Amino acid sequence: MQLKKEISLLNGVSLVVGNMIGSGIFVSPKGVLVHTASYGMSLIVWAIGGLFSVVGALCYAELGTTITKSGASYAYILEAFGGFIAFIRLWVSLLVVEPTGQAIIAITFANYIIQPSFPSCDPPYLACRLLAAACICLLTFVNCAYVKWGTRVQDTFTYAKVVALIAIIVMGLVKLCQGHSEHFQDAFEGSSWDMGNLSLALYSALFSYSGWDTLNFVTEEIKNPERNLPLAIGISMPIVTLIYILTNVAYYTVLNISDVLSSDAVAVTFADQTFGMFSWTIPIAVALSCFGGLNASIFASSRLFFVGSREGHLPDLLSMIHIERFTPIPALLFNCTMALIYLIVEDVFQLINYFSFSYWFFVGLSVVGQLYLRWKEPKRPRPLKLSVFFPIVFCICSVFLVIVPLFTDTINSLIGIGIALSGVPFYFMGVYLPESRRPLFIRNVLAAITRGTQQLCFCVLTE
Amino acid sequence: KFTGLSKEELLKVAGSPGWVRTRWALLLLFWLGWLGMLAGAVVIIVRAPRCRELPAQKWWHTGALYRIGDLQAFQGHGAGNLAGLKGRLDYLSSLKVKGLVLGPIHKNQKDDVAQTDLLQIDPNFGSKEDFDSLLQSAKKKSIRVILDLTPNYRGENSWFSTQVDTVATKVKDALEFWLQAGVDGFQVRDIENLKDASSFLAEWQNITKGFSEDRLLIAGTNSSDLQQILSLLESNKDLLLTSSYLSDSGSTGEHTKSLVTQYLNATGNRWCSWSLSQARLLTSFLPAQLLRLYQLMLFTLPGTPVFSYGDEIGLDAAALPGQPMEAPVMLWDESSFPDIPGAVSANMTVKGQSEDPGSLLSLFRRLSDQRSKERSLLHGDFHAFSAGPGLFSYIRHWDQNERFLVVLNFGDVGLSAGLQASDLPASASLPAKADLLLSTQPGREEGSPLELERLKLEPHEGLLLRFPYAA
Ligand SMILES: NC(=[NH2+])NCCC[C@H](N)C(=O)O
């Protein structure tokens, strides 16, 4: 009952692309424009942020072919660094990174599926929450029934949103090269070359490329984890970078920086401006995007928790697998329950302030772990070893990305450190002490409840 | 000890009828709860009320306007040309305006009508091509440009009183010529001086509307009574009519309340233009302690607010000695007026005021930011309710965007804002405690939701309270 490697190259490309291109390019490509205030330098910052994210993705290709173990930030931290920081990553990704991520993506799905019915005002909060919870439950059931159903949902919907972004880019280039070329005549004017603006420009050009390693969270289920993973990342990164640059070319050709910077739904404003009829195509597109980019944070997180239960940190339950269909049911139910719990909170969009120092700290610490491996143990079987230039420059970039939310948002990021650190009690009280030394009553009730949910969830431990 | 049951049990003790029936029941209860979540979503989507339609306003609603009464007196000597002004479009867009009005740039000498035409650029200001480059740079920086077509702008009579038919022809062909050139509107002044005002002005309106629907024609009259306003505004309804209808005010709260409310009830809550005159400044009719008060009202009345050049700093035409009243000079820096230097203070130039939040230019920038970006001010409905003896209190609410409330102290003593309304619709439910975006007088902190009962209004203090969509 091993996890039954059933992911192809196209499915890996679909996961990565489907995890990067989300609501981060349709509702707010302003984080760069608001701190650059021009077109040419904004496109250059997009290109350069993309180049740095590509160097990072190549770092992770090297990693995910060296270790070949799921999680990509809980096994890579685990090996060569030890149990402690591994469990710290798993804790912050169980409390306020994966639940908040999926809850926000589902809430944006709800907001932009009914937006064509509620254009100018605020949709009823009740409908937002109920429809987002229904979307999460449907995606958890899909990913439970058959892993192939999850891969097919992800593939279909990343096809849909890539077609929508192709439509945007094509309309932008048509308007550009038809007769107008109106804003791209004296670009770079009014820009700000003082580091106090280009810093935040790049730092918000990186939060738009986050998600280029969803495929490394499930390295173990890939067909040929030594060839399909790096080839899949190398087929994804250029596609996402080119789509980002050309989509912003479309926006800046049709719309004006000001309105863009004002459009809470920049792509919706673009639809209203250029799509005379069929203005309800881009809201549908953002809805399909948030759906196919939720099934990439449920087909990649519920494997993180899986590796978690496998190494001994989380109860052995989350390691089970359905006998007849080979899908990690209990991990999926744990992730669905986490997301639905973190849907009760009003305004979860603020929780992007508590992990914007934890997520990138842990990506950077995985990179530091790769460098630690390269130095200490250079005799590993490495089916590809890229030049240390890539890990070192991406480590410097991640030092940038984890110091920026430490200068500003300092109280928030320190509460995020408090959240991540809150796991150390569970670690030093229940995890570190070995079996036969933990209390008999708690272990007995865990045995009873594991037997219960294992008989109910219809799952078994890996063999 | 114990361990997860082997698949063997998963095959014997789990496949028992009881456990499989329980599992089927759990799954079916799940899908019942999920069809229930869908039913809830789909029913609550038809429970919240529909979303009102945006009136799809033109450009001249999306922000204030702005006049350049004379190109030369705006920046100063030497650079008093269109190409020189082309740099100031980085300054103007800091004020966050969505308009502009150049002065009459056609060649005009004096009463002589046979030589003065409305097409030839007066060469002392520049040429055609620099003008087109100015227009293109403006367009690029989201600032539409208007143009003044008052023919006899150098002379007492402005319409060439001798003749009326051929000047109409000059205006006729100049409209279409400059519109092909790329101007985004037109204005004329002293329409009460032009005989056959209503009909000729309606004809020019038809011209500028036939060329496009995002063009503008603004007529300015020195009138001060509402009756003249209506009598000229019967056949023309797309005509922002800037007049001295307000400037005659004695700054009495009840007087200005009656005045604005009567103007709106006479035009039936149409779209109007709020200014004190056709080209005069604010300070030419208002004391300096009253200016913040007015500029808080003009940026919140349901219309397009129309300021002359220099009324974003409080430029006075009488404070600086030896200054021409009709066309003062803007005060950029200490070197703005090289004559009798040293008297130019630091709080009187745009430079020294641009950094102080408790200045007047800061008030202008924050207001014109709250105007050109917030829905409920751009086109929201306007409803005034009574208040204390000498106050001015109203509410701006569109559908569900941030609902604004304004109150203004038109008195020289400490007034009390009673704020009893009892008459606004249910979509205008007053909160007992309301926010505060800014105040004409520094001393009340912004971001403090203040209760709507105990309010003591110091002399000439304005209030821009805010609250979200309440039910
Ligand atoms: N597994 C993940 N990294 N999930 C997060 C995906 C979010 C992605 N940065 C986006 O642009 O929406």
Based on the domain organization, do B273 and B252 belong to the same domain?
Answer: yes
B111-150 burial, b for 16+ CB within 10 Å, e for fewer?
eebeebebeebeeebbeeebbeebbbbbeebbbbbbbbbb
- Identify which of B232, B216, B219 has the alpha carbon closest to the alpha carbon of residue B188: B219
Based on the domain organization, do B394 and B426 belong to the same domain?
Answer: yes
* Residue A326 in tokens: 């080979």
Q: How far apart are CA A278 and CA A298, in angstroms?
A: 31
Tell me how long chain B is.
Answer: 471
> A50 and A244 in contact (C-beta within 8 Å)?
yes
What residues does B306 pair with on adjacent strands?
A: B65
* Residue B387 in tokens: 């208040």
Q: How far apart are CA B35 and CA A345, in angstroms?
A: 23
Q: How far apart are CA A260 and CA A26, in angstroms?
A: 11
Long-range contacts of B13-21 (CB under 8 A, 24+ apart): B13/A455, B14/A455, B14/A458, B19/A455, B19/A456
Q: What does residue B143 show for φ and ψ, rounded to 5 degrees?
A: -130, 100
Sign of the torsion formed by the C-alpha atoms of A170, A175, A177 and A181 = negative
> A247 and A169 in contact (C-beta within 8 Å)?
yes
Q: Half-sphere exposure of A459 toward its Cβ, with a 13 Å CA cutoff?
A: 27
> A99 and A140 in contact (C-beta within 8 Å)?
no
Q: How far apart are CA B359 and CA B441, in angstroms?
A: 9
Based on the domain organization, do B281 and B204 belong to the same domain?
Answer: yes
Q: Which residue has the tokens 């985004």?
A: B184
Q: How far apart are CA B346 and CA B26, in angstroms?
A: 76
- A190 contacts on B by Cβ (under 8 Å): 90
Q: What DSSP letter does each residue of B306-338 carry, written as one string? A: EE-TTTTTT--SSSSTT--SSSPPP--STTS--
Q: Three-state DSSP class for A139?
A: helix
Which residues are CB-contacts of A166 (< 8 A; sequence separation ≥ 6)? Answer: none
- Identify which of B243, B230, B252 has the alpha carbon closest to the alpha carbon of residue B280: B243
Based on the domain organization, do B185 and B170 belong to the same domain?
Answer: yes
Angle between helices A266-274 and A228-254 (to 10 degrees): 60
Domain count, chain B: 2
* Helical ranges in A125-214 per DSSP H: 125-145, 147-175, 195-206
Sign of the torsion formed by the C-alpha atoms of A226, A230, A235 and A240 = positive
* Residue B113 in tokens: 């009508």
Which CATH number characterizes residue B425's domain?
Answer: 2.60.40.1180
Based on the domain organization, do B295 and B444 belong to the same domain?
Answer: no
In 3-state terms chain B splits into helix, strand, coil percentages (rounded to 5) of 35, 15, 55
> B80 and B105 in contact (C-beta within 8 Å)?
no
Q: What DSSP letter does each residue of A355-385 carry, written as one string? A: STTHHHHHHHHHHHHHHHHHHH-TTS--S--
Q: What DSSP letter does each residue of B237-248 carry, written as one string? A: SS-EEEETTTTT
Q: How far apart are CA A108 and CA A106, in angstroms?
A: 5
* Helical ranges in A176-300 per DSSP H: 195-206, 228-254, 257-262, 266-274, 281-292
Give B44's DSSP letter.
H
Which CATH number characterizes residue B139's domain?
Answer: 3.20.20.80
Cβ of A24 below 6 Å from ligand 1: yes
Q: Three-state DSSP class for A222?
A: strand
Q: How far apart are CA A311 and CA A278, in angstroms?
A: 51
Q: What angle do CA B62, B68, B71 make, to 5 degrees?
A: 140
Sign of the torsion formed by the C-alpha atoms of B44, B47, B48 and B53 = positive
- Identify which of A20, A287, A12 has the alpha carbon closest to the alpha carbon of residue A151: A12
Domain boundary among B341, B361, B378: B378
- Identify which of B373, B375, B358 has the alpha carbon closest to the alpha carbon of residue B439: B358
The answer to whether A455 contacts B10, with C-beta atoms less than 8 Å apart, is: yes
Measured in Å, residue A21 CA sits from the centre of ligand 1 at 8
Measured in Å, residue B293 CA sits from the centre of ligand 1 at 49
Q: What DSSP letter does each residue of B141-167 carry, written as one string? A: TT---EEB--TT-SSSSSS-TT-SHHH
- Letter for the amino acid at A211? G
Measured in Å, residue A210 CA sits from the centre of ligand 1 at 5
- Identify which of B270, B268, B259 has the alpha carbon closest to the alpha carbon of residue B297: B259
Cβ of A158 below 6 Å from ligand 1: no
* Residue A345 in tokens: 């909170």
* Residue A1 in tokens: 């009952």
Task: Burial-class residue B351 by CB neighbours within 10 Å (0-12, 13-18, 19+).
Answer: middle
Hey, which of A14, A15, A19 would you mutate to test ligand 1's pocket, going by the most ligand atoms within 8 Å of its Cβ? Answer: A19
> B219 and B201 in contact (C-beta within 8 Å)?
yes
What is the number of H-type helices and E-type strands within chain A? 19, 2
> A36 and A42 in contact (C-beta within 8 Å)?
yes
Q: Three-state DSSP class for B375?
A: helix
> B260 and B284 in contact (C-beta within 8 Å)?
no
Q: Three-state DSSP class for B28?
A: helix
Cβ of A36 below 6 Å from ligand 1: no
> B284 and B311 in contact (C-beta within 8 Å)?
no
* Helical ranges in B212-290 per DSSP H: 226-232, 253-267
The answer to whether A124 contacts B14, with C-beta atoms less than 8 Å apart, is: no
For residue B186, give the H/E element and its range. strand B186-189
Q: How far apart are CA A458 and CA A321, in angstroms?
A: 8
Based on the domain organization, do B307 and B434 belong to the same domain?
Answer: no
Cβ of A53 below 6 Å from ligand 1: no
* Residue A8 in tokens: 């192809």
- Identify which of B391, B402, B406 has the alpha carbon closest to the alpha carbon of residue B457: B391
> A332 and B30 in contact (C-beta within 8 Å)?
no
What would you measure as the largest C-alpha separation in chain B, in angstroms? 114
* Helical ranges in B110-225 per DSSP H: 128-140, 165-181, 197-211
Question: Measuring from atom 9 of ligand 1, which residue has the nearest CA?
Answer: A210
* Residue B363 in tokens: 């008030």
Q: How far apart are CA A3 and CA A6, in angstroms?
A: 9
Is B182 within the bounds of a domain? yes
> A202 and A189 in contact (C-beta within 8 Å)?
no
Q: Half-sphere exposure of A145 toward its Cβ, with a 13 Å CA cutoff?
A: 11
Neighbours of B215 (CB within 10 A): 23
Q: Which residue has the tokens 């050009």?
A: A205
Q: What angle do CA A27, A31, A32 make, to 5 degrees?
A: 120
What residues does B148 pair with on adjacent strands?
A: B187
- Identify which of B208, B205, B194, B193 has the alpha carbon closest to the alpha carbon of residue B234: B205
Q: What angle do CA B87, B90, B92 make, to 5 degrees?
A: 105
> A102 and A298 in contact (C-beta within 8 Å)?
yes
Q: Which residue has the tokens 């779209």?
A: B271
- Structural domain range at position B193: 61-378
How many angstroms away from the CA of A306 is the closest CA of chain B? 15
Is B28 within the bounds of a domain? no
Q: How far apart are CA B255 and CA B447, in angstroms?
A: 32
> What experiment produced this structure?
cryo-EM
Give A314's DSSP letter.
S
Based on the domain organization, do B414 and B265 belong to the same domain?
Answer: no
* Residue A230 in tokens: 């790096």
* Residue A69 in tokens: 């173990």
How close are the terminal C-alpha atoms of chain B, in Å?
Answer: 61
Atom of ligand 1 nearest to the CA of A211: 3
Measured in Å, residue A209 CA sits from the centre of ligand 1 at 8
Based on the domain organization, do B374 and B390 belong to the same domain?
Answer: no
Q: How far apart are CA A370 and CA A388, in angstroms?
A: 10
Cβ of A211 below 6 Å from ligand 1: yes
Q: How far apart are CA B76 and CA B332, in angstroms?
A: 9
Domain boundary among B378, B394, B419: B378
Interface of B with A (CB under 8 A): 1-7, 9-10, 13-14, 19, 22-23, 26, 30, 34, 37-38, 40-41, 44-45, 47-48, 51-54, 90, 140, 142, 373, 375, 399-401, 469
Question: Measuring from atom 2 of ligand 1, which residue has the nearest CA?
Answer: A211
Is B174 within the bounds of a domain? yes
- Identify which of A86, A149, A101 has the alpha carbon closest to the alpha carbon of residue A310: A86
Is B349 within the bounds of a domain? yes
* Residue A325 in tokens: 């269909």
Which residues are CB-contacts of A28 (< 8 A; sequence separation ≥ 6)? Answer: A264, A266
The answer to whether B45 contacts A114, with C-beta atoms less than 8 Å apart, is: yes
**Using alpha carbons only, how large is chain B's radius of gyration in Å?**
29
The answer to whether B9 contacts A455, with C-beta atoms less than 8 Å apart, is: yes
> A191 and A41 in contact (C-beta within 8 Å)?
yes
Measured in Å, residue A272 CA sits from the centre of ligand 1 at 27
* Residue A379 in tokens: 């005799």
C-alpha torsion B397→B399→B402→B405, nearest 10: 10
- Identify which of A239, A161, A208, A212 has the alpha carbon closest to the alpha carbon of residue A42: A208
* Residue A11 in tokens: 């499915």
Is B133 within the bounds of a domain? yes
Q: Which residue has the tokens 């529909």?
A: B50
> B410 and B256 in contact (C-beta within 8 Å)?
yes
Give B192's DSSP letter.
G
Based on the domain organization, do B368 and B403 belong to the same domain?
Answer: no
Cβ of A297 below 6 Å from ligand 1: yes
Q: How far apart are CA B248 and CA B258, in angstroms?
A: 13
SS3 for B390-405 is CEEEEEEECCCCCEEE
**CA B109 and chain centroid, separation:** 34
Q: How far apart are CA A382 and CA A287, in angstroms?
A: 40
Domain boundary among B378, B398, B430: B378
Q: Three-state DSSP class for A111?
A: helix
Tell me how long chain A is.
Answer: 463
C-alpha torsion A51→A54→A59→A62, nearest 10: -140
Q: What does residue A223 show for φ and ψ, rounded to 5 degrees?
A: -60, -65
Is B326 within the bounds of a domain? yes
> B313 and B331 in contact (C-beta within 8 Å)?
yes
Residue among A117, A134, A456 whose CB faces B38 most closely: A134
> A417 and A406 in contact (C-beta within 8 Å)?
no
Based on the domain organization, do B279 and B385 belong to the same domain?
Answer: no
Q: How far apart are CA B226 and CA B229, in angstroms?
A: 5
Is B419 within the bounds of a domain? yes
Domain A9-460 classification at class level: mainly alpha
- A124 contacts on B by Cβ (under 8 Å): 44-45, 47-48
Q: What angle do CA B426, B453, B377 make, to 5 degrees?
A: 50
Q: How far apart are CA B277 and CA B288, in angstroms?
A: 18
Is B40 within the bounds of a domain? no
> A345 and A109 in contact (C-beta within 8 Å)?
no
Based on the domain organization, do B292 and B402 belong to the same domain?
Answer: no
Which residues are CB-contacts of B185 (< 8 A; sequence separation ≥ 6)? Answer: B60, B99, B144, B145, B146, B147, B208, B215, B216, B217, B218
Give B102's DSSP letter.
E
For residue A336, give the H/E element and its range. helix A329-341
Based on the domain organization, do B303 and B424 belong to the same domain?
Answer: no
Q: How far apart are CA B128 and CA B138, in angstroms?
A: 15
Residue among A110, A124, A258 whose CB faces B48 most closely: A124
Task: Burial-class residue B390 by CB neighbours within 10 Å (0-12, 13-18, 19+).
Answer: buried
Q: Half-sphere exposure of A322 toward its Cβ, with a 13 Å CA cutoff?
A: 17
Q: How far apart are CA B434 and CA B418, in angstroms?
A: 14
